[PDB]
Write a protein that binds this ligand. Structure first.
Ligand SMILES: [Mg+2]
Ligand SMILES: [Zn+2]
Lengths: 48, 124, 272, 59, 419, 484, 43, 205, 241
């Protein structure tokens, strides 16, 4: 979830962990929310 | 393009040989096969009444009048069919011409007057 | 409250009105002149009353229908028009004017007495008695809204009443204590722009296009395309030839292809 | 107002226009079995008239 | 002059082209107006494009009136003692006494005391046919109290059977029952008689019509029917059929002036469709559009004509269920056997499966025609087989070997590229 | 097509949704790319699998229509008038001899073994296994009081491509059905795989009906003699309640509310008094057999038609509404037609039709219906002119907006959007999903999403974010409710 | 005849000759159904 | 009701702009008395840069609005005082903005004082707490350094951004000058919220 | 084949039945808020028709236009037409329109108010004739306005015969171009005045919201002409040139 906004830049900048613009942090808000719901520990107990 | 007198027009899409068309137990086979899904939204109910009435006309040997706003009774017209040896609904047992197998359902088949519209595919 | 805010103008209260030993049927008027001057000697026909007698009468079915009081009217007219003495009687009304409202018209040199009398009656009959200007109706509607409980649940409340006026006046509605002024919703883009700014007017365009679409409307991102294009300059521009000139003026070739090439071409050559 | 001068001619002719609706009701004046009914205006005032000259609402 | 080229697609189209009437406003004017029934077909119009609601069709009994002898009626009216001359009465006088202004053919020619009495007297005269011509409009405006007479061209008429009653005897019996009632007779209600309304058309008259011994102008002569224009229709209460007239035979609260024949509200093309009131009407409009496009014996003198884009269909049939429209036009079509079923999905969405044998045997087969017209110049051009050596600009790849004496002989098949 | 007698462009009926076309005389253009560059981009960019999901609405476009909608119902139907809906090995093999896929294996089957229709469908959905669970179009609360439903027909369920139960009809296989079978196949396997499944399930449905049959007759639209008298009784009740409103008017008892005149209040009273009750379907459903009635099965499965279509044919047409208003008197001051008197009170005079289509209308009834029909044909023609002019001005005002290398939208340099759609996504690539934390309370949320297995501070931080995301969502979309 | 009357209308230079085209190597015909064709095929 | 709404929301506007009042807040009755007598009410506030902002509230029938001479005299007299001025806000009724003469006075006085901002606003702009209206998203002024870093990462010029007028109600309550940047958090029905940056241009009047 | 068609240049042509408006009747429709047209016809299907328009403006003026060949959309206020025809008294002029002066019903008083406000407007072209008392000089002013071949005033007025010639010409032309269907001689001028009064009365009744305007689609005011009438009209119109 912390690296999700790099889907809007590329894998070169994700490796270097350069700063992310604020408008691209907002763009990943719904998907970060959904990932934290559907991948909660209460749901991913049997996943290896 | 063909059409009946109720405004139901369509395009000829396929032409089949004689051995490929459906036939009834007495050998009656159609000239045209029209889709039943052309009826329920268009509500061309006079075309179905014409098939019912004309089916008994042909066996009687007569030509009758179906002008608009004359009194009609589809219940009494459907009992005329039974008096002529047919079913109440005017449906018959039919076979698939390609396999020879019968449908598990009687098919509504009978004479309906049709017209050829002057819109020729060779010209367009 | 739905009755409190609806614009009741002066025209609709009166049933008849006549614009003017006096005229016939005026014995009760001098009787009105007789019994009124004894009621309170604080006021009297002032020093400035020249030649006009604008007598009116009121339909009495109106006030009982809308709970109006004759006190409310008389206080209303002379809290906005400090050039008349009203003669409010106890229903008939005879408004008298002053000459002091006839001489400040130096901007007009053809001002006679007939037209200037119509104008002040025109300027006077439009004076509100009660409500907010521009609100013609106001019905009561039942709303469905969500709210968070004390247990932290989000529930849908269906027993909420609200007023759906006819006509838009956002500024007037915040000048009213019976209405929550932080939640006013207008259907007007131009009014929302004037009162709130460009960002609220952009949201208004999205909402107003969405209602016109119906139920099989497009995806939401196609609505943001219209709203963001029409507001990109800080003002609301149209989807006509005028808006194209405001957003892309140097694109002569695009603007020629839309509407009128010869006029666009002539302007382009002169400005180089 | 209506019923007075807006439709005075029509109301006086209504008993004789054959395209007007009738009502099965006895007339107080000439004792006729049927009457003529009309419904004029946005308030839908109902007026009954007769050939003899009778009219409802004190005509 | 607004004229159209006569396109003889079939006989029905030929007859319908001669009965065509041609012209938010642009949409309100394409509606079905309340004045149409009996004069304009309620079903027939175009179905796509801007031509929808533009061309109107005359209904089956509607005719167009020719100009009457207005001078004779004008001089008869001015001789009527019940009409006061225009200059013999004043505006004050005609508002005070409530007189009604009398017009003939548009112009105000006097005033009368009782407009209803004058209108009904001249209507009774029009029925005998000698004093007033039967094609005269007689309108009476009861809202503003005027009488109008019309005799100009362009009026649409249609015959209507007349209904008569006994309202006078009923009224007298009511009065006499009241006389017994007030005086003290306890049997006052036995003096009343029932109300009766009826037409004078009889089954024997229908039999005589079908036998040729009776005509419309003979029905008018004895006042069994009369002609009504859309102006005079507003004075008429019409029973929509003889069943409705019999239902109210003793109803004093619904007195009809005329009785209609229901089939008269449709035109000739719309009457080809059988059981048309059992179908949704928009489909009947579609049929009026499609009935005139169909092939057939488009004319009986085709071999003598040189036409463009005309189709002659060899075989035609009378429908097994025919209508009254087939008493007046030749049917063009066939009594096809139709199965209403699903067969492999090839008739989906307005398609049909045809029998190839039906096609081979000549079902809906015919001959199609195209014409040509090439002109010559005086002494410059001529007809003849070109010689490539002394002629320039011969069309490339063109086959000139078919030409004999300048034209290809009759009976040879021409191809693409042939001269 | 190598038959020299054919001159038509031929296509599959399920492709007509892309072009909004049908087969009553439409013409389409066709050109074949000859250049290598134009041929590459035709195949990689412009193939019709790229338009399976709508750009306008983000849902699927194609599916079954009309023969595969009603043929999928007949195939997966649990019971037939002949007993169980089963076929032998020869006929089950025959359903696949046209699908143009790889045939299944029937080697563990004997000639006399019987296969249900749901068994045969599963042999096809195993290639692209999906999960599906909804109720079909077949099950309707409208028909439930007067009709027996098989319990194994009214809840369609697919588990890894196995059709466990239920019927397939418009809700699952129909064209433009969001969340249906082909929309799900497209999401897991791609849109070309979904188009291949529409064809294969369409051949299964068509080959089933070439043994089962499907027709419609005049006797399908005919009420029983006792059921005809029940419709008349329902109609008389409407005309009795209509004549009570008239009787009140004759006594001056009609008092409108504030804002309405006596005319407009009277016309509103009549309009609601002349509406068919919901029980008009009781005499209709007592006259038909839902197992064999073809007109009923096309409507009930969503293949073609609606319930108001069926009521008009069989029972009655009712009141004609133009601009949600009755027939206004435009024939000479208070008459609607020459057949009715002036200031008439009967409901028939303003467009109430007591007849059905199968009975035959009278002349005044036919005229009222013709006025209704002419209105619709006129509104249709205005679609070409009204929206075409507005379309060209929208196109010229918006055509310069193009996506950048940052996913912004600009007009040559000037920003219009900072990110396209504020999320930077293609509208053909969206799925509708439910966020199951929004509506919970803090005790329901405490139970469902907070983990107590391991006592560590990291699992307290995880639950706090689930609360924070929930509250931020609530706050934002509660505000959106306030300015709408 | 003008030089500048060629430009404006829907039949003018801009909207007819420039924003649209007449092309070669194209065909037109009536369409009909064929249930043996795949959804991405045309006969 | 405009005067009573002004009497509360003008001091709420002063507080929202991070300014301290240099005077004593008189009761509402005294306030309307002074407005009806003198023709205007003067409020003085101090910014963090120790500058003075003077607010003039004009009555809907005073002399300063109907004649340009009185307004010109007032403006010349006030700008000659010994205060380190930053801005003068003049609040008038809506039709005043349409009268040309006063606008000419304001532009003439702007030309004479290049160091001072003179702004004239209608009544409705101060008759409510503008930042708390639900329909209006959250506006925020960002520095030239953050704006520069944003534009440098984005390869943009300030003239490429969407623009906003300096007399936009939220920007007026913020105190934003032309040549500045404003960042907005706005609700989204596609991503639940979005951030844009706008460029402040010249005001309407 | 029944026939009824035309052959021209070898092709077959059908002269369409054309739907025209009924003549000799008043059509009331909605500055100018309302408009009353009236195409009068001397009597017969082929005669020439003169259109008059009686329009009512927001100011209050009721002006009258006569579209025809000799003139071109000249608008005359309604009082001046009545004065040109031998009728001067204002009470009498109103009795042409209201038919009364002694009924104080709402419609009557409202009508009289409308007419009184109407007769006090300043038409730009009819200013110096606004309050004239006689007819012959009004006719002279008309001839000054309308005569196209006249462009030199104060030259033909130096003689006498031309003035009488112009007065006779205007009288006879307006006796043919104003309501020809009632007659074209001078003895039918008073009845023309009464008919015009009744027409204006009807227009003002439509103003009063007592009756609706004319229904443009109803067939009580339509005529269908066809081949004969249209052929004669074209055979005479192109005969002119
Ligand atoms: Mg089509
Ligand atoms: Zn009586």
């Amino acid at each position: 979830c912390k690296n999700l906004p790099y889907v809007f830049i590329n894998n070169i900048q994700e490796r270097l962990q350069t700063p992310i613009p604020v408008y691209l942090k907002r763009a990943a808000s719904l998907m970060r929310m959904l990932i934290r719901i559907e991948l909660a520990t209460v749901k991913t107990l049997n996943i290896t | 393009k063909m059409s009946s007198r109720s405004g139901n027009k369509g395009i000829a899409a396929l032409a089949l040989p004689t051995s490929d068309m459906p036939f009834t137990e007495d050998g009656l086979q159609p000239d045209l096969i029209v889709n039943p899904h052309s009826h329920p939204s268009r509500m061309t109910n006079g075309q179905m009444i014409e098939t019912t009435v004309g089916l008994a006309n042909a066996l009687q040997g007569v030509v009758t009048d179906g002008t608009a706003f004359l009194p009609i009774n589809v219940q009494l017209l459907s009992e005329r069919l039974a008096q002529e040896g047919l079913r109440f609904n005017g449906c018959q047992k039919m076979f698939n011409g390609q396999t020879g197998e019968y449908f598990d359902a009687a098919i509504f088949i009978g004479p309906t007057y049709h017209q050829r519209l002057q819109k020729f595919v060779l010209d367009d | 409250i739905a009755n409190s805010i609806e614009l009741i103008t002066f025209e609709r209260l009166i049933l008849q009105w006549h614009l003017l030993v006096m005229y016939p049927d005026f014995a009760s008027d001098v009787e009105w002149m007789t019994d009124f001057l004894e009621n309170h000697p604080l006021l009297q026909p002032p020093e400035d009353i020249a030649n006009w007698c604008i007598r009116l009468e009121l339909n009495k079915t109106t006030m009982i229908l809308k709970s109006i009081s004759l006190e409310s009217i008389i206080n209303s007219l002379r809290a906005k028009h400090p050039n008349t003495y009203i003669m409010h009687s106890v229903i008939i009304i005879r408004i008298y004017l002053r000459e002091s409202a006839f001489r400040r018209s130096t901007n007009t040199r053809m001002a006679t007495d007939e037209k200037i009398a119509v104008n002040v009656v025109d300027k006077l009959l439009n004076s509100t008695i009660r409500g907010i200007p521009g609100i013609k109706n106001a019905n009561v509607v039942k709303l469905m809204r969500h709210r968070v409980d004390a247990q932290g649940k989000l529930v849908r409340l269906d027993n909420i009443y609200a007023i759906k006026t006819n006509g838009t006046n956002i500024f007037g509605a915040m000048l009213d204590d019976n209405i929550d002024p932080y939640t006013i919703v207008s259907s007007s883009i131009g009014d929302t722009m004037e009162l709130y700014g460009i960002e609220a007017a952009r949201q208004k365009i999205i909402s107003e296009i969405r209602t016109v679409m119906g139920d099989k409307g497009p995806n939401h991102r196609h609505l943001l395309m219209y709203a963001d294009l029409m507001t990109r300059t800080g003002q609301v521009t149209s989807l006509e030839k005028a808006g194209l000139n405001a957003r892309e003026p140097s694109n002569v070739l695009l603007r020629m292809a839309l509407s009128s090439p010869v006029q666009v071409l002539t302007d382009a050559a002169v400005d180089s | 107002g209506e019923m007075e001068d807006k439709y005075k001619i029509f109301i006086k002719n209504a008993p004789f226009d054959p395209t007007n609706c009738q009502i099965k009701k006895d007339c107080p004046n000439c004792h006729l079995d049927y009457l003529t009914q009309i419904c004029i205006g946005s308030q839908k005032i109902i007026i009954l008239v007769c050939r003899c000259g009778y009219m409802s609402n004190r005509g | 002059v607004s004229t159209q080229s006569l396109e003889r697609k079939n006989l029905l189209n030929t007859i319908s082209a001669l009965r065509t009437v041609n012209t938010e406003r642009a949409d309100m004017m394409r509606r079905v107006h309340a004045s149409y029934p009996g004069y304009i077909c309620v079903a027939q119009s175009a179905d796509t494009g801007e031509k929808v609601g533009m061309s109107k069709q005359l209904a089956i009994t509607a005719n167009v009136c020719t100009a009457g002898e207005v001078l004779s009626l004008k001089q008869r009216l001015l001789s009527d003692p019940a009409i006061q001359q225009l200059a013999d009465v004043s505006n004050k006088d005609i508002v005070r006494k409530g007189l009604a202004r009398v017009f003939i053919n548009g112009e105000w020619i006097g005033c009368c005391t009782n407009a209803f009495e004058l209108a009904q007297r001249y209507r009774m005269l029009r029925r005998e046919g000698k004093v007033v011509h039967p094609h005269t409009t007689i309108y009476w405006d009861s809202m503003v109290d005027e009488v109008e007479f019309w005799l100009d061209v362009g009026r649409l008429t249609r015959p209507l059977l007349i209904v008569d009653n006994n309202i006078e005897k009923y009224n007298q019996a009511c009065y006499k029952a009241a006389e017994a009632r007030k005086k003290g007779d306890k049997d006052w209600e036995k003096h009343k008689i029932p109300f009766i309304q009826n037409t004078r058309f009889t089954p024997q008259m229908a039999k005589d019509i079908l036998a040729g011994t009776l005509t419309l102008e003979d029905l008018v002569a004895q006042g069994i029917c009369e002609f009504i224009t859309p102006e005079e229709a507003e004075n008429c209460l019409v029973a929509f059929s003889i069943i409705e007239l019999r239902k109210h035979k003793h109803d004093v609260t619904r007195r009809f002036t005329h009785v209609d024949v229901p089939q008269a509200i449709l035109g000739l093309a719309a009457l080809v469709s059988p059981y048309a009131n059992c179908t949704q009407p928009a489909r009947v409009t579609y049929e009026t559009n499609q009935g005139r496009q169909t092939g057939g014996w488009y004319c009986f003198s085709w071999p003598y004509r040189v036409d463009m884009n005309r189709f002659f269909q060899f075989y035609n049939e009378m429908p097994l269920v025919k209508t009254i429209a087939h008493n007046y036009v030749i049917p063009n079509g066939l009594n096809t056997i139709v199965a209403y079923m699903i067969y492999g999905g090839y008739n989906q969405e307005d398609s049909v499966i045809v029998s190839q044998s039906f096609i081979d045997r000549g079902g809906f087969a015919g001959t199609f025609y195209r014409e040509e017209k090439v002109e010559l110049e005086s002494d410059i051009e001529s007809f003849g087989k070109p010689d490539p050596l002394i002629t320039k600009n011969l069309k490339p790849g063109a086959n000139y070997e078919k030409l004999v004496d300048g034209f290809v002989p009759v009976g040879t098949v021409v191809k693409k590229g042939d001269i | 097509l190598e038959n020299p007698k054919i001159s038509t462009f031929q296509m599959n009926v399920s492709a007509c949704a892309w072009y909004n076309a049908d087969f009553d005389g439409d013409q389409m253009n066709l050109w074949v790319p000859w250049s290598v560059m134009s041929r590459v981009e035709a195949e990689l960019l412009c193939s019709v699998r790229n338009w399976f999901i709508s750009t306008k609405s983000s849902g699927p476009v194609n599916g079954q229509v009309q023969d595969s909608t009603v043929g999928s119902f007949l195939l997966t139907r649990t019971n037939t008038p002949m007993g169980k809906n089963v076929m032998n090995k020869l006929h089950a093999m025959g359903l696949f001899q046209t699908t143009q896929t790889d045939p299944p294996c029937f080697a563990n089957y004997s000639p006399t073994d019987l296969l249900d229709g749901k068994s045969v469908v599963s042999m096809l959905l195993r290639q692209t296994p999906i999960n599906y669970q909804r109720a079909p179009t077949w099950y309707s609360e409208v028909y439930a009081p007067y009709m027996h439903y098989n319990k194994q027909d009214i809840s369609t369920q697919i588990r890894n491509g196995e059709l466990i139960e239920g019927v397939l009809d418009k809700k699952a296989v129909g064209a433009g059905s969001s969340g249906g079978i082909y929309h799900l196949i497209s999401r897991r396997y791609g849109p070309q795989q979904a188009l291949k499944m529409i064809f294969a399930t369409q051949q299964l449905a068509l080959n089933y009906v070439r043994n089962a049959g499907f027709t419609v007759s005049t006797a399908d639209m005919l009420l029983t003699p006792e059921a005809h008298q029940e419709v008349q009784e329902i109609i008389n009740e409407l005309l009795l309640e209509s004549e009570e409103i008239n009787n009140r008017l004759l006594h001056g008892d009609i008092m409108p509310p504030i804002g309405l005149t006596t005319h407009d209040f009277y016309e509103k009273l009549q309009l609601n008094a002349l509406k068919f009750p919901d029980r008009i379907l009781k005499p209709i459903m007592n006259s038909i057999n839902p197992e064999t009635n073809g007109l009923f099965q096309m409507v009930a499965t969503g293949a073609k038609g609606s319930n108001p279509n069926m009521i008009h044919i069989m029972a009655g047409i009712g009141q004609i509404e133009i601009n949600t208003q009755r027939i206004q008197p435009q024939f000479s001051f208070g008459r609607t037609l020459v057949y009715y008197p002036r200031f008439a009170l009967e409901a028939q005079a303003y467009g109430f039709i007591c007849n059905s289509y199968i009975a035959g209308l009278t002349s005044p009834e036919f005229i009222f219906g013709e006025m209704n029909g002419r209105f619709d044909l006129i509104n249709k023609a205005l679609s070409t002119s009204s929206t075409g002019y507005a379309n060209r001005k929208a196109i010229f005002g918006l055509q310069s907006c193009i996506v950048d290398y940052y996913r912004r939208v600009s007009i040559d340099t000037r920003l219009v959007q900072q990110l396209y759609g504020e999320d930077g996504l293609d509208a053909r690539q969206l799925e509708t999903v439910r966020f199951e934390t929004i509506m919970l309370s803090d005790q329901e949320l405490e139970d469902k999403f907070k983990y107590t297995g391991i006592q560590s501070p990291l699992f307290e931080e995880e639950f706090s974010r689930l609360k924070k995301d929930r509250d931020k969502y609530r706050q934002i979309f509660l505000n959106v409710e306030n300015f709408n | 005849p003008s030089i500048m009357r060629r430009l404006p209308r829907k039949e003018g230079r801009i909207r007819k000759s420039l924003l649209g085209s007449q092309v070669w190597s194209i065909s037109r015909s009536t369409i009909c159904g064929n249930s043996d064709l795949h959804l991405d095929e045309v006969g | 009701m405009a005067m009573q709404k002004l009497f509360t929301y003008i001091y709420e506007f002063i507080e929202y702009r991070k300014m301290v009042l240099l005077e004593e807040k008189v009761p509402y009755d005294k306030f309307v008395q002074m407005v009806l007598n003198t023709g205007f009410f003067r409020i003085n506030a101090e910014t963090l840069n120790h500058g003075i902002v003077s607010v003039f509230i004009f009555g809907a029938n005073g002399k300063y609005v109907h004649h340009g001479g009185d307004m010109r005299t007032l403006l010349t007299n006030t700008l000659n005082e010994k205060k380190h001025y930053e801005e003068l806000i003049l609040i008038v009724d809506k039709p005043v903005l349409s009268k040309k003469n006063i606008l000419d006075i304001i532009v003439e006085q702007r030309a004479a004082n290049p160091t001072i901002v003179i702004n004239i606003y209608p009544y409705h702009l101060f008759c409510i707490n503008i930042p708390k209206v639900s329909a209006i998203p959250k506006h925020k002024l960002i520095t030239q350094e953050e704006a520069q870093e944003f534009l440098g990462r984005e390869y943009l010029q300030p003239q490429d951004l969407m623009q906003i007028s300096a007399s936009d109600p939220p920007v007026v309550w913020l105190g934003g000058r032309p040549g500045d940047f404003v960042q907005i958090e706005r609700p989204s029905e596609t991503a639940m919220h979005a951030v844009v940056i706008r460029f402040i241009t010249k005001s309407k009047i | 084949e029944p026939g009824g068609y035309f052959i021209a240049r070898g092709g077959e042509w059908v002269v369409d039945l054309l739907e025209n408006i009924r003549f000799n009747t008043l059509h009331i429709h909605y500055n100018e808020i309302i408009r009353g047209e009236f195409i009068s016809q001397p009597g017969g299907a082929f005669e020439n028709s003169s259109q008059i328009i009686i329009r009512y403006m927001t100011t209050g003026a009721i002006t009258i236009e006569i579209n025809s060949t000799k003139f071109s959309k000249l608008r005359i206020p309604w009082y001046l037409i009545f004065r040109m025809f031998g009728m001067t008294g204002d009470d009498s002029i109103i009795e042409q329109v209201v038919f009364d002066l002694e009924s104080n019903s709402l419609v009557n008083t409202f009508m009289i108010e409308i007419l009184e406000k109407s007769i006090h407007v300043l038409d730009p072209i009819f200013q110096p004739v606004q309050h004239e008392l006689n007819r012959e000089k009004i006719i002279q002013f008309l001839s000054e306005k309308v005569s196209k071949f006249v462009s030199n005033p104060s030259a033909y007025k130096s003689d006498e015969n031309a003035v009488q010639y112009l007065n006779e010409r205007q009288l006879t032309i307006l006796d043919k171009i104003l309501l020809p269907h009632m007659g074209q001689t001078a003895d039918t001028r008073v009845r023309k005045l009464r008919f015009l009064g009744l027409l204006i009365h009807k227009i003002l009744l439509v103003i009063m919201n007592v009756f609706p305007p004319t229904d443009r689609d109803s067939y009580r005011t339509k005529r269908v002409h066809g081949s004969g009438v249209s052929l004669a009209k074209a055979f005479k119109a192109i005969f002119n040139t």
